[PDB]
From Swiss-Prot:
Temperature characteristics of this protein: Optimum temperature is 25-50 degrees Celsius. Optimum temperature is 55 degrees Celsius. Optimum temperature is 60 degrees Celsius. Optimum temperature is 65 degrees Celsius.
Activity-regulation annotation: Activated by magnesium ions. Activated by calcium ions. Inhibited by the serine hydrolase inhibitor phenylmethanesulfonyl fluoride (PMSF).
Organismal lineage: Bacteria, Bacillati, Actinomycetota, Actinomycetes, Streptosporangiales
Pfam families in the record: PETase (PF12740)
GO molecular function: cutinase activity
Active site per database record: S130 (nucleophile), D176 (charge relay system), H208 (charge relay system)
Keywords: Disulfide bond, Hydrolase, Periplasm, Secreted, Serine esterase, Signal
Catalytic reaction equation(s): pentanoate ester + H2O = pentanoate + an aliphatic alcohol + H(+); an octanoate ester + H2O = an aliphatic alcohol + octanoate + H(+); decanoate ester + H2O = decanoate + an aliphatic alcohol + H(+); a dodecanoate ester + H2O = an aliphatic alcohol + dodecanoate + H(+)
Outcome, altering D174R: Increases the thermal stability of the enzyme
The protein, known as: Cutinase cut2
Binding site for poly(ethylene terephthalate): Y60, M131, W155
């Protein structure tokens, strides 16, 4: 038995629903209380248990409102999730990496006892939009103990992520003009090692802002990746391997992976 399995055996409907099977509560993190980031919102399952924890960063000029839906959706599948504001809206990716790390340490050490009692501090993940996604790659390269990273339409001047040893799903947007996939997402994916669990999902008919509103594909595969790697939950491998169908008449523009993933 894997002790980290939470919730029912998954279906496409379970992952495409607007909410997961867990009811969620929220805790505000004031900018005054936040050490090393700008505050945020913690979403957590009401059901008392331990869960993996996830920190999510917005991008340049972005606020926590740009990523709130995804914190709430992921928490509803059995995770403790913090959506942050950064110290300033103009912070660069490597500053965002430090703020992600600070947000993980906040959830583990400084949130309410209601939140801290629901966290398995050994099972952590990071995500982010745009510069936030660049920050996710940077922190993942520094912290091989993270269980997953999910950069969403990532932006970073560093193209070489050969040092990353964390299971990483990069989601790109085909029509992205801010972080074009030819110069950001695809080079990032191609530089990740062939020896890690990794995937690249390029959305069809998507701008750079696709992650900022509820999106069935982003929510399905984000949750499947977190389940597979944060919870070691091999019930979710079915969604990732061989993964969504791509090209002409597909669900996505492109999907690449290193399937099969080691257990």
């Amino acid at each position: 038995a894997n002790p980290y399995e939470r919730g029912p055996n998954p279906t496409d409907a379970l992952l495409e629903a607007r909410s997961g099977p867990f009811s969620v509560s929220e805790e505000n993190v004031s900018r005054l209380s936040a050490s090393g980031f700008g505050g945020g919102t913690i979403y957590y399952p009401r059901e008392n248990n331990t869960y993996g924890a996830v920190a999510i960063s917005p991008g340049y000029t972005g606020t926590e409102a740009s990523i709130a839906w995804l914190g709430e959706r992921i928490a509803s599948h059995g995770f403790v999730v913090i959506t942050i504001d950064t110290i300033t809206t103009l912070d660069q990716p490597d500053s965002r990496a430090e703020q992600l790390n600070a947000a993980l340490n906040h959830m583990i050490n400084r949130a309410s006892s209601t939140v801290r009692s629901r966290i398995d501090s050994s099972r952590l993940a990071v995500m982010g939009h745009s510069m936030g996604g660049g920050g996710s790659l940077r922190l993942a390269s520094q912290r091989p103990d993270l269980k997953a990273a999910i950069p969403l339409t990532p932006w970073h001047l560093n193209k070489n992520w050969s040092s990353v040893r964390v299971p990483t799903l990069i989601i790109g947007a085909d029509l992205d003009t801010i972080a074009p996939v030819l110069t950001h997402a695809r080079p990032f994916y191609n530089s990740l090692p062939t020896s890690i669990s990794k995937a690249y999902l390029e959305l069809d008919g998507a701008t750079h802002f696709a992650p900022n509103i509820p999106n069935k594909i982003i929510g399905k595969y984000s949750v499947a990746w977190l389940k597979r790697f944060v919870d070691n939950d091999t019930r979710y491998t079915q969604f990732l391997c061989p993964g969504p169908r791509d090209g002409l008449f597909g669900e996505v523009e492109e999907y690449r992976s290193t399937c099969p993933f080691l257990e």
